[PDB]
């Protein structure tokens, strides 16, 4: 039936500056009552989607006036006159030309381009409780950094580790616009006790050089 | 909460799941209800709508034949049933209210979502919670929430009294097929000797609540 384009996929914007998001429909969304049935929704990190703009240009209740929708027919635009940290999330357009057929666009992630911030790096040995169960999890934390690009290298007794770690990254923080990253190195208790030095080496453009946090024991 | 949904579910491939969405009386009688799902890390996908007052249903083409919406007018509750489940159906399923026809002004009220996991290992399993102890002006500590299934888990600190500096990370799927998640908080280093830190881990699919004291 009707296909919805959204562009760009991601949009980095300096705080206080305007953002513009495009949505394209393969068919006109203008109905015989004069309304364009194109909505905009925002999904903030960890939350349900929320209505932002309905029917092309109508602000939902509580939506500040820096959000505005424009367009008619097949080309629509969401403008944020001045982006702020709370606006971070994924914006989706949606057509409802026929009441019985609704279709979402692919979404646009808004990224707040705050200033560069080097991560604070912490390393955690496995707990006594876990070691009694036969496995050792070593955790490295990269806290409150920007931008998202970062590399974590596990080294055990100076040997580069491979294939035994997993990481995940939070979404951009709604207040300070940073990311955090958690990396877990997993070994058997028997392997953990074979070695002495456990190190997490972090590369990030906010740092002068790679920083290493480590501990002795195991 | 204006729209209440049923709890998280885990089901085997090929079986079915039924998710509920309860509204107020007056809301139910003046509304259509859309079902919108979101696979992990993916975008929103409209599955269809029901208008409970006239028992009218429209299904997205992709779902015609194995989704059914129903409604109980006596309890102001509508239901989504998805049959012949596949791995691709693992998602959060949202209920969203909207006006019918000439009263459509967007999906203005949304439920919190229901996590549905499709797995041939369809057994709820409670997490093991291990401290991430501080040491080695700002210190970090945390809890490791390991080997649980299915999603989701929520974590609070000091029963919600401590929110500043808290980061709870997306879980990762380990090689065993179980999830693992960490939650951390940064605090003044001077607080390590005087303030107790407890993470409260809630895994509702197993009705598990765990408090773990994290000592330096």
């Amino acid at each position: 039936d009707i296909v919805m384009t959204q562009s760009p996929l991601s949009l980095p914007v300096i705080p206080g500056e305007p953002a513009s998001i495009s949505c394209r429909s393969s068919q006109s969304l203008l109905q015989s009552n004069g309304n364009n049935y194109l909505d905009w929704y925002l999904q903030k990190p960890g939350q349900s989607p929320q209505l932002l703009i309905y029917l092309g240009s109508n602000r939902a209740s509580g939506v500040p006036d820096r959000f505005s929708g424009s367009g008619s027919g097949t080309d629509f635009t969401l403008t944020i006159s001045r982006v702020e940290a709370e606006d971070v999330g994924v914006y989706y357009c949606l057509q409802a030309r026929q009441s019985s057929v609704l279709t979402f666009g692919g979404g646009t992630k808004l990224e707040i381009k705050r200033t560069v911030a080097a991560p604070s790096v912490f390393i955690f040995p496995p707990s006594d409780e876990q070691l009694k169960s036969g496995t050792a999890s070593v955790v490295c934390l990269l806290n409150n950094f920007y931008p998202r690009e970062a590399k974590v290298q596990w080294k055990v007794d100076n040997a580069l580790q491979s294939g035994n770690s997993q990481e995940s990254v939070t979404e951009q923080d709604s207040k300070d616009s940073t990311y955090s990253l958690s990396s877990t190195l997993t070994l058997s208790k028997a392997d953990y006790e074979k070695h002495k030095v456990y190190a997490c080496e972090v590369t990030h453009q906010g740092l002068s050089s790679p920083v290493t946090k480590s501990f002795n024991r195991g | 909460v204006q729209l209440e949904q049923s709890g998280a579910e885990v089901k085997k491939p090929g079986s079915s799941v039924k998710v509920s969405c309860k509204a107020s009386g007056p809301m139910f009688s003046r509304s259509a209800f859309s079902w919108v799902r979101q696979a992990p890390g993916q975008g929103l996908e409209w599955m269809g709508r029901i208008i409970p007052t006239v028992d009218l249903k429209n299904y997205a083409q992709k779902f015609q034949g194995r989704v059914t919406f129903t409604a109980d007018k006596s309890t102001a509750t509508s239901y989504m049933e998805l049959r012949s489940l596949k791995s691709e159906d693992t998602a959060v399923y949202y209920c969203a209210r909207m006006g019918s026809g000439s009263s459509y002004y967007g999906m203005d009220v949304w439920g919190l979502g229901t996590t549905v996991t499709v797995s041939s290992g369809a057994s709820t399993k409670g997490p093991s919670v291990f401290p991430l102890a501080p040491s080695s002006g700002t210190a970090a500590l945390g809890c490791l929430v390991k080997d649980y299934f299915p999603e989701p888990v929520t974590v609070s600190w000091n029963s919600g009294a401590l929110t500043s500096g808290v980061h709870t990370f997306p879980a990762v799927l380990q090689s065993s097929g179980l999830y693992s998640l960490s939650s951390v908080v940064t605090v003044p280093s001077s607080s390590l000797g005087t303030q107790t830190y407890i993470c409260n881990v809630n895994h509702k699919p197993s009705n598990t609540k765990v408090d773990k004291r994290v000592e330096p």
């Binding site: 015989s32 009441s99 | 009688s29 509304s31 007052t53 006239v54 019918s100 000439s102």
Partner: peptide, 13 residues
């Protein structure tokens, strides 16, 4: 109902 589908009426009344 075609009327409801084109946003001309509201089938909840």
């Amino acid at each position: 109902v075609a009327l409801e589908n084109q946003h001309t009426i509201d089938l909840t009344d």
